[PDB]
Amino acid sequence: NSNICEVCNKWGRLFCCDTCPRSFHEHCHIPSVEANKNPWSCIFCRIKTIQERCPESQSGHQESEVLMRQMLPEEQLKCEFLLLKVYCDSKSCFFASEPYYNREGSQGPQKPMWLNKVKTSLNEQMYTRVEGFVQDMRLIFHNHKEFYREDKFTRLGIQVQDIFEKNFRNIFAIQETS
Numbered sequence: 001n002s003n004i005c006e007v008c009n010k011w012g013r014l015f016c017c018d019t020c021p022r023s024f025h026e027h028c029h030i031p032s033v034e035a036n037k038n039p040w041s042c043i044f045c046r047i048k049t050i051q052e053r054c055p056e057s058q059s060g061h062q063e064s065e066v067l068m069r070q071m072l073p074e075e076q077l078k079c080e081f082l083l084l085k086v087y088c089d090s091k092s093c094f095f096a097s098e099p100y101y102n103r104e105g106s107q108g109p110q111k112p113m114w115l116n117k118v119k120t121s122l123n124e125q126m127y128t129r130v131e132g133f134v135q136d137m138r139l140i141f142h143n144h145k146e147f148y149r150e151d152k153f154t155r156l157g158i159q160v161q162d163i164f165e166k167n168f169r170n171i172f173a174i175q176e177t178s
């Protein structure tokens with residue numbers, strides 16, 4: 001197994017996947033690493049199993065159809081993994097915790113959002129459809145764009161949104177287009 005956390009790339013108290021070489025801090029893994037369960041398989045392994053049990057799940061889909069899906073166990077898992085993939089980028093640190101807004105010439109967003117709030121929302125099963133999760137994810141970056149305006153710090157929002165969107169297209173097998 002790896003000697004660093006797959007998500008945050010640091011050493012520490014790590015739990016090791018029994019089916020691949022990755023390791024995680026307890027609360028870096030999503031969901032949080034389970035108390036018992038020997039063997040334990042990580043979320044990367046659980047996602048791989050879904051594609052193996054249904055190879056056709058990787059044929060192209062329309063985003064509109066994906067969004068309307070109910071959050072049954074396999075969609076729930078896919079959203080948890082997509083969220084994990086955003087936390088894997090070091091730039092997620094800017095969007096992890098509850099922000100605040102006091103900038104000359106800007107007003108705060110009507111509906112603030114942040115990655116740890118989405119994490120809690122997923123953990124507490126508050127999303128009934130994929131759409132709920134994706135809307136809040138996209139809201140994070142939209143709020144950032146709007147608030148920071150022409151400051152070059154807006155680019156962080158763009159960069160972390162691009163990570164989200166690529167992973168969304170991959171995980172949910174969105175039909176490739178030009």
Ligand SMILES: [Zn+2]
Pocket residue numbers: 005006007008009010024025028
């Ligand atoms: Zn970690």
Ligand SMILES: [Zn+2]
Pocket residue numbers: 017018019020021022041042043044045
């Ligand atoms: Zn694994």
Ligand SMILES: [Zn+2]
Pocket residue numbers: 053054055056
């Ligand atoms: Zn099948």
